[PDB]
Amino acid sequence: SYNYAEALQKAIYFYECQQAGPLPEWNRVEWRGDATMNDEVLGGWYDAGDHVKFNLPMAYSAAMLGWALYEYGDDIEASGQRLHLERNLAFALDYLVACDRGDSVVYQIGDGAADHKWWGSAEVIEKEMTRPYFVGKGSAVVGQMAAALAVGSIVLKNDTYLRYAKKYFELADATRSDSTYTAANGFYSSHSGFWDELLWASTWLYLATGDRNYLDKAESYTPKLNRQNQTTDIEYQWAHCWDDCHYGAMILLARATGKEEYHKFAQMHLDWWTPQGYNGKRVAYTPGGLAHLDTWGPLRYATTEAFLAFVYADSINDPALKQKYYNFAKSQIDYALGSNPDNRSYVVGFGNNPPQRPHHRTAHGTWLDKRDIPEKHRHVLYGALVGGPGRDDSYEDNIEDYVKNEVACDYNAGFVGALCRLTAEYGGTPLANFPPPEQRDDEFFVEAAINQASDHFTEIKALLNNRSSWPARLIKDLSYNYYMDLTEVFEAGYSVDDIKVTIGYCESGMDVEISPITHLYDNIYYIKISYIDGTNICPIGQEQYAAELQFRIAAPQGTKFWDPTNDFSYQGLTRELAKTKYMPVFDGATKIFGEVPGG
């Protein structure tokens, strides 16, 4: 089968890849640093392969993580993953508490259009754009926030989360309107309305407190749910998801009240997902056996359903129904992990032939605001469940396909609960030395070329690069040195002041200084090129990743002695721009790349 413990390990790690700054000390991702530190609310998760904090799918995802712990936290101790899941969840819940603004909440950080227009790493995005925030009291988003904190308070034994959960619930339930929820439009619009979120939140508050007032509230919301088409049944032909949690709330109410109506719903809905269907009606299935709800993120929907199915089956006694729901659930998870017509994992860094080009900016690690360069991802986004194949099982691993190769908090969330269930049952041993170290590239370096050369001068075209990625970062006090040998000038009967330093081109907006020619030792001299605000050299675009200077060092015109062939920093240069080690880069007084004459 699969190593379900390893899959869970990675599936949890994914959330560490998504953390906004400040990072917790326990963050295990070597290519992530503090990012978006000027955000109006710190911490929390970037939503997908972007850098927007969208509170609806964020809170949804945390609620699902808390649900996993609530069902199976004791059952996953063997795998060693319980503590990882717990602290990863607190990280998000802390963000939700931090969004509190009294009569409203911060519900979004980032303008989605502007965020999406740019391709580059989290840690440098503030060099590209200012990130706005948005405040309101939308019942769906605030209700999902309440739900997340309620389940959170239970599994994390935390009074503060419970107090915020109640506050948020009262706010959503007083407001009864999504009219102040605007900034997520077209990305995470409230399609189903807010009645499902009030149901889901009050259900979890009932589970957290035992106060039957919340049970009464919860049940009072079920006649407000959307109907299946034009019938009197509650809608069941869809998945538990970021926009609609009434599905799982009904399952939770089945077990807590034992009432018939909730079991009838549960089995109607779950039946529609199974290959056997509900009275001849069923979700689309690929020939390969994937329950395929929609073009967008079909694995997300099916793996979340596998979780609901495991929980409902674990909660009933009928062996026929248990087997049917268990076999549906395991079949969807196993599809995602490799049991499909291509025998390939749809989880990054897991299993056989996993996706290698997820639509994920920071894991990609470009310097150029381009998706095609670099042609391979510089980092491994371990654990990320991709969108998945089409209705016909077709799929290509292509960074451009944000439909099939998107990754997201909400994709991973229900998938994590399902993997908890499968680990509990089959165990497995998590990877010992995970995550292993990545192969790194040079991050700060000069590329140089002989721009023009004559028998009295050397002209150098120098581009000081910031292509950092481990993590992408900014360095203000950047400089580099050009080392020369003046033996031939002295031997011909000339001196240092016979040699003059000039500039032939200085890139606009890169405030720059060049030192006088300076003695190092013997006949070896150098100039330092210093950028006053080196942070403007950053991997955010075609123009910004490198600063260009053209400088000339010249002997008096007409003369013939100049010999650049013995100059340390001239070594290996051609007419073509290339990386060189012999023009070393410094951060303040510390050399960070290259070599120096002697030492």
Ligand X SMILES: OC[C@H]1O[C@@H](O[C@H]2[C@H](O)[C@@H](O)[C@H](O)O[C@@H]2CO)[C@H](O)[C@@H](O)[C@@H]1O
Ligand Y SMILES: OC[C@H]1O[C@@H](O[C@H]2[C@H](O)[C@@H](O)[C@H](O[C@H]3[C@H](O)[C@@H](O)[C@H](O)O[C@@H]3CO)O[C@@H]2CO)[C@H](O)[C@@H](O)[C@@H]1O
Backbone angles phi, psi at 593, to 5 degrees: -155, 145
Strands 444-454 and 578-580: antiparallel
Contacts of 255 (CB under 8 A, 6+ apart): 315
User: Two tokens at 36?
Assistant: 């978006």
Determine contact, residues 16/29, Cβ cutoff 8 Å: yes
* Contact between residue 585 and residue 478 where contact means Cβ atoms under 8 Å apart: yes
CB 103, min distance to Cl ion, A: 7
To the query of whether residue 359 is one of the catalytic residues in this protein, the response is yes
| 197 labeled binding residue | yes
Q: Check whether 216 is labelled as a binding-site residue.
A: no
406 belongs to the binding site for ligand X (CB under 6 A): yes
- d(CA 186, CA 196) in angstroms, rounded, equals 20
Smallest CA-to-CA distance from 469 within 375, 557, 361 is with 361
- Residue with smaller CB distance to Br ion, 441 or 491: 491
**What gap in Å lies between CA 94 and CA 45, rounded to an integer?**
11
Cβ atoms of 109 and 130 closer than 8 Å? no
Please say whether the dihedral angle defined by the alpha carbons of residues 464, 467, 468 and 470, taken in this order, is positive or negative: negative
* 511, interface contact from Cl ion, Ca ion, its own copies, none, CB < 5-8 Å by kind: its own copies
> Restricting to residues 162-221, which ones interact with Ca ion according to CB under 5 A?
192, 196
Of 417-436, binders to Br ion (CB under 5 A) are: 431, 433-434, 436
180 touches, from ligand X, Cl ion, its own copies, none (C-beta below 5 to 8 Å by class): Cl ion
What span, in angstroms and rounded, lies between the C-alpha atoms of 584 and 480? 5
CB atoms within 10 A of CB 469: 25
For residue 193, what are its two tokens?
Answer: 């309305």
Residue count of the chain, please give it: 599
Residue 235 interacting with ligand Y (CB under 6 A): yes
Collapsed DSSP state (helix, strand, coil) of residue 62: helix
Among 178, 243, 443, 485, binds ligand Y (CB under 6 A): 243
Closest CB to ligand Y among residues 161, 188: 188
Q: For ligand Y, which residue of 101, 191, 259, 476 counts as binding (CB under 6 A)?
A: 191
Binds Ca ion (CB under 5 A): choice among 485, 541, 547, 568 = 485
User: Is 502 a binder of its own copies (CB under 8 A)?
Assistant: yes
- Nearer Cβ to ligand X (216/543): 543
Selected range binding its own copies among 224-232, 342-350, 416-424, 505-513, rule: CB under 8 A = 505-513
Residues of this chain, 89-128, that bind ligand X according to CB under 6 A? 116-117
Rounded to whole angstroms, the Cα distance separating 336 from 300 reads: 9
Q: Which is nearer to its own copies, 428 or 541 (CB)?
A: 541
Among 442, 507, 587, 595, binds its own copies (CB under 8 A): 507
In the complex, the smallest distance separating the C-beta of residue 135 from ligand X, rounded to whole angstroms, is 23
**If you write DSSP's letter for every residue of 457-469 in order, what string do you get?**
EEEEEEEEEE---
Question: Interaction with its own copies in 86-125: which residues (CB under 8 A)?
Answer: none
Q: Which amino acids are annotated catalytic?
A: 359, 397, 406
Which residues are documented as binding site for Ca(2+)? 192-193, 196-197, 243, 485, 488, 563, 566-567
Q: Which residues bind Ca ion (CB under 5 A)?
A: 140, 192, 196, 244, 485, 563, 566-567
Q: Which residues bind its own copies (CB under 8 A)?
A: 500-513, 532, 550, 552
